[PDB]
Amino acid sequence: MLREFSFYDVPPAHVPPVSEPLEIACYSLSRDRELLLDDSKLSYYYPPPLFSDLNTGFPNRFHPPKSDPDPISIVKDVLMTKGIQMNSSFLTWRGLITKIMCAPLDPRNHWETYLVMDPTSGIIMMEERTNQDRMCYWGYKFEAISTLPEIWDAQDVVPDEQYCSIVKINIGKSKLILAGEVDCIWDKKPCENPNLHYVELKTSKKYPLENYGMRKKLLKYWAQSFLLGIGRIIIGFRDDNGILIEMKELFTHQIPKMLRPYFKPNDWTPNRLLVVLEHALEWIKQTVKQHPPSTEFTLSYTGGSKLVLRQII
Ligand SMILES: [Mg+2]
Numbered sequence: 001m002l003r004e005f006s007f008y009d010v011p012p013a014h015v016p017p018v019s020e021p022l023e024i025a026c027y028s029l030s031r032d033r034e035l036l037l038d039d040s041k042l043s044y045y046y047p048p049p050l051f052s053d054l055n056t057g058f059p060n061r062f063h064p065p066k067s068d069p070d071p072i073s074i075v076k077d078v079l080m081t082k083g084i085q086m087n088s089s090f091l092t093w094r095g096l097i098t099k100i101m102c103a104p105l106d107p108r109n110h111w112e113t114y115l116v117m118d119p120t121s122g123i124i125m126m127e128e129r130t131n132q133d134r135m136c137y138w139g140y141k142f143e144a145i146s147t148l149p150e151i152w153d154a155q156d157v158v159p160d161e162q163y164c165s166i167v168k169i170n171i172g173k174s175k176l177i178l179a180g181e182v183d184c185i186w187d188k189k190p191c192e193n194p195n196l197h198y199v200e201l202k203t204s205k206k207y208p209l210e211n212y213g214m215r216k217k218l219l220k221y222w223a224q225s226f227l228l229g230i231g232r233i234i235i236g237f238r239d240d241n242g243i244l245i246e247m248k249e250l251f252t253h254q255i256p257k258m259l260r261p262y263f264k265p266n267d268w269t270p271n272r273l274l275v276v277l278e279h280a281l282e283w284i285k286q287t288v289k290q291h292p293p294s295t296e297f298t299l300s301y302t303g304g305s306k307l308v309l310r311q312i313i
Pocket of ligand 1: 143183200201202
């Protein structure tokens with residue numbers, strides 16, 4: 001069977017309450033993508049030199065990251081190994097909620113996720129089952145030059161090596177456990193919820209906020225970081241040569257405030273994106289629960305203004 005959810009059919013409701021995302025676990029990945037149950041790979045933000053060349057090391061010092069998606073079983077394994085209870089509606093990768101949330105924003109980004117309700121936990125688990133160009137490298141290079149590893153208590157661009165935060169976040173009536181890569185931390189991790197100390201690093205050409213493309217890009221920056229409770233998004237603005245010309249430190253909560261003067265009528269706004277997401281998540285829950293556990297579904301966005309949930313029979 002087929003179910004549809006239309007973005008524009010969502011009733012005009014108040015923005016759902018969203019809890020402060022609470023870290024329940026973290027882990028690291030080695031350069032060979034090996035899971036490590038520690039923060040050996042959490043690094044610190046330190047501003048890189050202005051006019052750094054983001055082409056340096058491409059492609060000979062570049063080790064492109066794994067192309068295939070990771071199974072969500074990993075996060076479950078991690079939590080099980082640590083003896084952490086999982087009591088939520090959803091378990092997935094932050095990035096897959098970003099896709100649902102931002103679907104109304106980029107009709108060109110088509111995607112497909114797999115969902116199954118676990119027969120023991122009753123949690124809906126979501127994953128993908130189906131990268132190395134110069135532009136991508138600019139982003140990875142900016143992350144590499146902007147970060148300092150732990151040294152006191154412990155160049156090749158190897159994006160496989162990373163640190164990850166697993167969070168509980170509630171969006172209205174939906175409880176989610178989300179795992180996502182954290183680029184670095186602003187200062188020492190409170191050994192206090194750590195997430196507002198976390199930093200996301202981005203590289204972009206700078207456009208005025210008048211520019212629709214720029215606003216949309218910022219909205220997606222905001223959405224991604226909002227879902228993991230990240231406090232800061234730091235943008236390395238680059239020119240067409242890939243030279244770092246300016247850095248801009250933003251607080252995540254400031255992006256919607258900063259964008260307020262520039263939204264044209266009928267623009268998707270942070271508040272509207274949250275309303276639609278809550279309704280999307282509620283729809284997914286009710287649909288999945290019309291079937292026995294271990295029923296596999298595909299959730300698809302293939303342009304237009306609808307999500308499609310398909311039972312795999
Ligand atoms: Mg980043």
